[PDB]
């Protein structure tokens, strides 16, 4: 899809191996924020939203938090605290046409900057002057969208690039989109080294009488440490008590 009409594809109940993507030279850009791209198959992801669009190479630097430009301001804005990944690859052989491609557009004018993850596809005539445009183009009345005109002979800075922005919500709620890691059996009333949906620790898992709400996955103590977890396989609430200790 065009950058102004960026497409959003939610994902659910699946497992993925981002190691064959990080090891792939096909992707010209693979940069993650808030989570290391290497250590990815550990933390069982929670929320997942794969946005996708096409820009030109000179604009790839705009797909980053705290950036400005045509794309960042008027087409696709990333929040400052964005936690996710940005992947981009050269799509010259697919999205470039001799004479210029007319299928990919971008928003050229807008009176205010876009909020994070905002999608504007309105085709209202931009009024640059005081006189109101009545749907007709002219002086200070221009069409808001412009075509990239991608050509195979263009410079690599002007060649088409397909960008995919994966956004997450790691370890904050019940996780659906998980990774490809096999589970083990759960042992109660014994000191174990536990890993629940990517949250790790050491402690004794015991039965509890805490009535968690269907949307709540983790509990916390006064110190903000993890107090209890809901078993992802059997919907029961288990308290996590550090492996009994005391001074010697």
């Amino acid at each position, epitope marked *: 899809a065009s950058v102004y009409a960026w497409n959003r594809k939610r994902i659910s109940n699946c497992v993925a191996d981002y190691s064959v993507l990080y090891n792939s030279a096909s992707f010209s850009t693979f940069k993650c924020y808030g989570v290391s791209p290497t250590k990815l198959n550990d933390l069982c992801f929670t929320n997942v939203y794969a946005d996708s669009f096409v820009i030109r190479g000179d604009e790839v630097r705009q797909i980053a938090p705290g950036q400005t430009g045509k794309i960042a301001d008027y087409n696709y804005k990333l929040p400052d605290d964005f936690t996710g990944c940005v992947i981009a690859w050269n799509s010259n052989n697919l999205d470039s046409k001799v004479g210029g491609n007319y299928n990919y557009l971008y928003r*050229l*004018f807008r*009176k205010s900057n876009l909020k994070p993850f905002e999608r504007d596809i309105s085709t209202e005539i931009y009024q*640059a*002057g*005081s*006189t109101p445009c009545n749907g007709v183009e*002219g*002086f*200070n009345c*221009y*069409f808001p969208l*412009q075509s990239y005109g991608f050509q195979p002979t263009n410079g690599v800075g002007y060649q088409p690039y397909r960008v995919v922005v994966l956004s997450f919500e790691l370890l904050h709620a019940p996780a659906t989109v998980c990774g490809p890691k096999k589970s083990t059996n759960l042992v109660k009333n014994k000191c174990v080294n536990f890993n629940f949906n990517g949250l790790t620790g050491t402690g004794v898992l015991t039965e509890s009488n805490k009535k968690f709400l269907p949307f709540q996955q983790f509990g916390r103590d006064i110190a903000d440490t993890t107090d209890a977890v809901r078993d992802p396989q059997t919907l029961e609430i288990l308290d996590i008590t550090p492996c009994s200790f005391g001074g010697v």
Partner: antibody
Amino acid sequence: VQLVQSGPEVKKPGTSVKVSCKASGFTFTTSAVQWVRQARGQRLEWIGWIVVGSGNTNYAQKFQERVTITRDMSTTTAYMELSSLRSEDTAVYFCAAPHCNSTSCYDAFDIWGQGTMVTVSS
Amino acid sequence: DIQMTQSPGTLSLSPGERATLSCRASQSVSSSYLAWYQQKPGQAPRLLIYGASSRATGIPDRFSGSGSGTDFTLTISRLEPEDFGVYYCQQYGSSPWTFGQGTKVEIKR
């Protein structure tokens, strides 16, 4: 807020001339640029206009055949190429644009270039 | 195309008098798309009036404008020595944005 044009040009008939027009002060990216010619002792002749952001062009009937108006937002400069020159083309050429901030534009052509004289004969 | 005609050809007036220039369009044009410019010999055009009745930045208040449809008027209340030049009216609503032939305001004698 300036508008600077090319220097004087002296070309043979049948050649091409490319007049430059560089903006300053205002935001070029959201304005438009018109081109006007004036023969020595004659009136003003509207050639055409261009939208800087989009690159769309509109030309006059008498210049549809040998004039092409272009722009380059990277060098904030607009150009006017005039092919197949002849003695009738010997004139002074002005470029005009409304000055604009980051979001709105002026409602007329208030910024004008100094003019570029193009001479052309055998 | 819309034809713009200016009058008079030569305006012979004494410094301090009231000048009046006329601009006629071959068809009715929007008032918000007409401008008046001043150009002196060997100089670039200078915007005087826009929107038919909106003085430009830096233009003295002695310059005024009126009209509607096909006929428009540029009025100079008191003619100053720095005002003797060539005046053009241009419509910029319907393409092509044609110009007038100009009006020379000269010092009478």
